[PDB]
Amino acid sequence: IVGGYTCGANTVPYQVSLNSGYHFCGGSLINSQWVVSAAHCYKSGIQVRLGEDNINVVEGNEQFISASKSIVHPSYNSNTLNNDIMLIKLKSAASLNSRVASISLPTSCASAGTQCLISGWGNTKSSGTSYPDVLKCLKAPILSDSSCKSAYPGQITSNMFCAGYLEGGKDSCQGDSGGPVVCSGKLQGIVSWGSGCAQKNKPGVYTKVCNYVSWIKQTIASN
Numbered sequence: 001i002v003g004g005y006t007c008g009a010n011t012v013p014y015q016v017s018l019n020s021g022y023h024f025c026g027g028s029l030i031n032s033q034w035v036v037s038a039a040h041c042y043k044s045g046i047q048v049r050l051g052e053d054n055i056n057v058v059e060g061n062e063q064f065i066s067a068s069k070s071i072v073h074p075s076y077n078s079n080t081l082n083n084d085i086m087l088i089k090l091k092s093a094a095s096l097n098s099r100v101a102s103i104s105l106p107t108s109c110a111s112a113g114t115q116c117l118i119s120g121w122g123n124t125k126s127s128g129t130s131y132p133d134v135l136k137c138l139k140a141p142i143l144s145d146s147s148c149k150s151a152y153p154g155q156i157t158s159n160m161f162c163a164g165y166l167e168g169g170k171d172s173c174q175g176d177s178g179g180p181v182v183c184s185g186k187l188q189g190i191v192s193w194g195s196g197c198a199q200k201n202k203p204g205v206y207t208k209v210c211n212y213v214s215w216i217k218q219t220i221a222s223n
């Protein structure tokens with residue numbers, strides 16, 4: 001997260017870190033045994049780390065649970081990043097509490113102008129490189145589909161939206177991949193792609209989660 005702020009320990013209780021020896025992606029806890037992330041975060045040997053603030057220090061609220069299975073969206077295209085969404089099932093149910101909690105799926109899509117909370121452990125620099133240990137947060141509005149399409153000609157599908165600031169300075173970044181965009185208590189987005197971070201006229205692009213709720217629910221019901 002570039003140009004954001006320190007969230008505060010466990011203030012984003014649905015935020016997960018996906019770990020394969022090291023943090024490599026974010027994710028969102030959606031019930032006691034399932035996490036939503038980006039398909040571009042797919043790999044084998046994932047351990048889901050819940051209740052994290054400082055990802056390099058055991059602080060006392062963590063739950064580490066290995067993934068039993070991952071399900072990349074059936075129509076995920078890694079070249080275009082269309083349908084950039086994946087479900088991860090935990091080997092055991094997380095113990096839900098005030099600091100480890102699921103985030104509600106939307107029943108309605110969000111409109112341009114609505115304010116959202118974007119979070120992660122990604123790069124905090126737009127030019128250089130610095131990775132934070134504690135969770136970073138950014139409040140950002142959803143941008144109009146027309147401004148999103150104008151920013152990235154030929155690249156924005158109906159399964160994507162832009163959020164952030166066309167003036168630059170404030171954005172998600174490398175390592176925030178797969179993490180949440182939460183608006184009015186609903187998971188509306190997944191950190192998907194961009195062109196660098198926090199650059200003028202190049203806001204972050206996010207998977208449009210409301211398009212996938214039916215798939216998420218039916219997948220959970222049979223797995």
Ligand SMILES: N=C(N)NCCCC(=O)O
Nearest residue numbers: 172173174193194196204
């Ligand atoms: N680039 C932005 N704005 N956000 C992060 C997307 C994932 C990435 O670039 O590695």
Ligand SMILES: [Ca+2]
Nearest residue numbers: 054057058059
């Ligand atoms: Ca920790």
